[PDB]
Amino acid sequence: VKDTYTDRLDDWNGIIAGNQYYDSKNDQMAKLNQELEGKVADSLSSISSQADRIYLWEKFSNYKTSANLTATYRKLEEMAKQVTNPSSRYYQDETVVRTVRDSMEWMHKHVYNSEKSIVGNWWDYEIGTPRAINNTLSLMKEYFSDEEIKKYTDVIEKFVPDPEHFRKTTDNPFKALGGNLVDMGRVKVIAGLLRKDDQEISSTIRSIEQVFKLVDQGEGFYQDGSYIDHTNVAYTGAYGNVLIDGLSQLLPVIQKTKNPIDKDKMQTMYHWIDKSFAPLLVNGELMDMSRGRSISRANSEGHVAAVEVLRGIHRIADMSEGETKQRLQSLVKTIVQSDSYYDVFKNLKTYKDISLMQSLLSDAGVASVPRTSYLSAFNKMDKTAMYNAEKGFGFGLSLFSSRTLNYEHMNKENKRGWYTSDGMFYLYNGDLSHYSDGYWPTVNPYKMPGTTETDAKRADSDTGKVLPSAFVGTSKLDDANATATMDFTNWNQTLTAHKSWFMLKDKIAFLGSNIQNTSTDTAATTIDQRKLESSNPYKVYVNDKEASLTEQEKDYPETQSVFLESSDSKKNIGYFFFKKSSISMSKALQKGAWKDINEGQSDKEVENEFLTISQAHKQNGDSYGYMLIPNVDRATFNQMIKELESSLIENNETLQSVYDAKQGVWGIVKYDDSVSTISNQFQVLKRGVYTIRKEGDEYKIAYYNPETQESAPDQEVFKKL
Numbered sequence: 123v124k125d126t127y128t129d130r131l132d133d134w135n136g137i138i139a140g141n142q143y144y145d146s147k148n149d150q151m152a153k154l155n156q157e158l159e160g161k162v163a164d165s166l167s168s169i170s171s172q173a174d175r176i177y178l179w180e181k182f183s184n185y186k187t188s189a190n191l192t193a194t195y196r197k198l199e200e201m202a203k204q205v206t207n208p209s210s211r212y213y214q215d216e217t218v219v220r221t222v223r224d225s226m227e228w229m230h231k232h233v234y235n236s237e238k239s240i241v242g243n244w245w246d247y248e249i250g251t252p253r254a255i256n257n258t259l260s261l262m263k264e265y266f267s268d269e270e271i272k273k274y275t276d277v278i279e280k281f282v283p284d285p286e287h288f289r290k291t292t293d294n295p296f297k298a299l300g301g302n303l304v305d306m307g308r309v310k311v312i313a314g315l316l317r318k319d320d321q322e323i324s325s326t327i328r329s330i331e332q333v334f335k336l337v338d339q340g341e342g343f344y345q346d347g348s349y350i351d352h353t354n355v356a357y358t359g360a361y362g363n364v365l366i367d368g369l370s371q372l373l374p375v376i377q378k379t380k381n382p383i384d385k386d387k388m389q390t391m392y393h394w395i396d397k398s399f400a401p402l403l404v405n406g407e408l409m410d411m412s413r414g415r416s417i418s419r420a421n422s423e424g425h426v427a428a429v430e431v432l433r434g435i436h437r438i439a440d441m442s443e444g445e446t447k448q449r450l451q452s453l454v455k456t457i458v459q460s461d462s463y464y465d466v467f468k469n470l471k472t473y474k475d476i477s478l479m480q481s482l483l484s485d486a487g488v489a490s491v492p493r494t495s496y497l498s499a500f501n502k503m504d505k506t507a508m509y510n511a512e513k514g515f516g517f518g519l520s521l522f523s524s525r526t527l528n529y530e531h532m533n534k535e536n537k538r539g540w541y542t543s544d545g546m547f548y549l550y551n552g553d554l555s556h557y558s559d560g561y562w563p564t565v566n567p568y569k570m571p572g573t574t575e576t577d578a579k580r581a582d583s584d585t586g587k588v589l590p591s592a593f594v595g596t597s598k599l600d601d602a603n604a605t606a607t608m609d610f611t612n613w614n615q616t617l618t619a620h621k622s623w624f625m626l627k628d629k630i631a632f633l634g635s636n637i638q639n640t641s642t643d644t645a646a647t648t649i650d651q652r653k654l655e656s657s658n659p660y661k662v663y664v665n666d667k668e669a670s671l672t673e674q675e676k677d678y679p680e681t682q683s684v685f686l687e688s689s690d691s692k693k694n695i696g697y698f699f700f701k702k703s704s705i706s707m708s709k710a711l712q713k714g715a716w717k718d719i720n721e722g723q724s725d726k727e728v729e730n731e732f733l734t735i736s737q738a739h740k741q742n743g744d745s746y747g748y749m750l751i752p753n754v755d756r757a758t759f760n761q762m763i764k765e766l767e768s769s770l771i772e773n774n775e776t777l778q779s780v781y782d783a784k785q786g787v788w789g790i791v792k793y794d795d796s797v798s799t800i801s802n803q804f805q806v807l808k809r810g811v812y813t814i815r816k817e818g819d820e821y822k823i824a825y826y827n828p829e830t831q832e833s834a835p836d837q838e839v840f841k842k843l
């Protein structure tokens with residue numbers, strides 16, 4: 123029956139498929155249509171069509187594996203999209219129409235109905251499958267009766283009757299928030315429209331509104347931009363993605379219902395975009411330290427995942443007006459145009475999304491200016507993101523503490539992410555493909571960049587842990603300078619180290635002290651493990667003399683500097699050791715398969731060449747100290763290390779500090795409340811992290827106590843001499 127409910131479903135169809143916007147003369151759209159044509163043809167040629175079958179598709183035949191239910195229904199959704207596309211060869215095709223109708227009936231009778239119980243992953247029974255069923259019925263509503271539609275959605279109400287909780291039919295339900303809560307909307311708001319149920323629609327929208335609240339504990343968005351999910355995991359880049367991607371799809375529909383959301387919370391969405399998402403996007407890539415276990419998925423590398431966020435932003439811009447709309451469009455435009463590695467259209471899967479992106483890119487009225495420098499201290503999720511616009515590099519610092527889990531290994535995904543938050547760092551430079559093209563299955567998991575660890579074997583079956591200490595955090599002074607520290611203890615309490623970082627605009631100092639090891643295993647810090655490009659080879663210099671690296675590890679005692687020289691200055695990486703250090707280096711081909719780190723991925727072998735730099739710590743009380751200087755040529759690097767000759771102020775068990783004389787900036791980490799006199803100019807008095815700038819006879823101060831998560835009055839922590 124035609125009514126206001128169907129009017130909303132028509133709008134939903136324009137969003138999830140957009141056939142009304144299709145244009146055969148539009149190159150990008152025709153490409154997506156061709157993809158869907160191929161998928162439907164494959165499904166139609168392989169579908170079991172015998173009497174009393176045991177499965178619709180052999181590839182997804184074991185219905186004990188819940189993933190097979192969702193995969194099956196998604197194949198039907200693809201058919202629905204094409205049968206309703208005037209330009210498809212399957213438009214109104216009699217076999218396709220009957221196949222969808224008959225398939226819904228078969229699954230309903232033998233696989234997914236109200237009499238069944240969750241077997242496998244609850245997600246498929248409550249979100250994945252219901253969304254596929256909803257979209258299929260919505261697109262093909264003119265081929266189903268209202269009675270059939272209610273019949274096929276009854277099961278959804280059985281598994282998801284309450285819009286505030288998930289896993290309601292199990293012995294351990296949970297309160298829905300964040301991304302999952304948004305999916306609750308794509309499940310119950312649409313089912314509500316299909317079932318013409320006003321109560322389901324209103325109550326679900328009511329529950330959804332919880333997503334707009336700022337939290338100070340638990341899952342959700344924090345005032346500093348952090349986003350936590352799964353109790354205590356940094357997750358802006360995966361569950362945050364779902365939240366904005368799904369919410370942006372629902373909003374146009376919700377705002378037209380009799381229960382619209384107060385247009386005051388959109389300001390809150392704009393804040394998420396600027397404070398939480400934007401900082402994590404560098405040259406079109408979404409920082410992996412915010413993506414949790416999704417880093418182990420081959421089809422979801424950094425640039426691909428980024429599109430989920432970008433399309434959410436451009437949809438939100440479309441529902442905005444004036445300046446806000448134009449500025450959001452500009453944000454998307456500049457990020458996309460800065461990405462010379464990935465084609466954004468490869469992950470725009472609906473015609474409306476393709477259309478919106480094309481108009482934005484071709485509209486001269488929408489500004490596309492390189493993004494300016496920034497530095498975000500996401501203390502509530504223990505991550506820090508830095509970007510320098512003048513030199514063009516991004517830096518990511520991945521930590522954890524007593525407040526956050528180090529890594530997520532669940533559903534057989536991310537089996538070797540053990541050290542991805544043990545003070546691991548990321549460098550985003552001219553090689554936009556660095557963390558892509560198979561980086562995750564080929565990187566040596568025992569030597570994540572920046573981490574100090576022993577060489578003990580680790581089990582894939584292990585799961586994440588929190589850190590014993592709360593002394594982990596970042597003190598930010600401005601858009602270019604900040605200081606961080608991590609009171610580190612390894613996974614089995616056999617090694618410790620006071621690790622600190624000094625972000626000084628165009629370089630980052632890495633200091634480590636109090637390194638102790640009580641095990642029989644060898645300890646070392648991985649200075650770097652950089653994935654190489656066969657097209658852009660590096661010329662390696664040690665103490666400014668060319669060195670020839672081999673697969674076999676070579677030792678370089680008394681090293682003052684290491685420089686990786688590319689033909690592109692924006693890919694250069696230099697390391698300056700404040701005090702001559704004993705390191706080792708190697709360049710080797712590393713092989714692996716995505717299945718090695720994620721059970722559901724391909725076992726196909728992947729390979730990449732990596733350059734590894736490390737420093738062994740054979741004695742208790744050992745330390746390390748070096749400056750990472752990216753994006754400058756060889757001569758300039760050599761000049762800079764001369765300028766930085768005496769930049770190291772101290773690096774011991776209670777005090778770590780680096781001074782940038784050119785800027786007049788100090789980075790300081792104090793592990794106790796003793797009076798520390800710095801450069802014979804001032805004194806710092808409390809345990810904590812500092813970033814200070816001297817301007818004339820004035821001092822700008824940024825202090826942070828990571829344990830109490832508080833700053834402090836100036837006179838309590840600083841005193842000029």
Ligand SMILES: OC[C@@H](O)[C@H](O)[C@@H](O)CO
Binds near residue numbers: 353525831
């Ligand atoms: O004070 C908020 C903490 O920083 C968070 O990381 C929580 O522990 C999340 O569970």
Ligand SMILES: OC[C@@H](O)[C@H](O)[C@@H](O)CO
Binds near residue numbers: 353354527587588
């Ligand atoms: O990660 C530390 C947490 O306290 C867990 O031990 C709980 O079980 C909740 O996830």
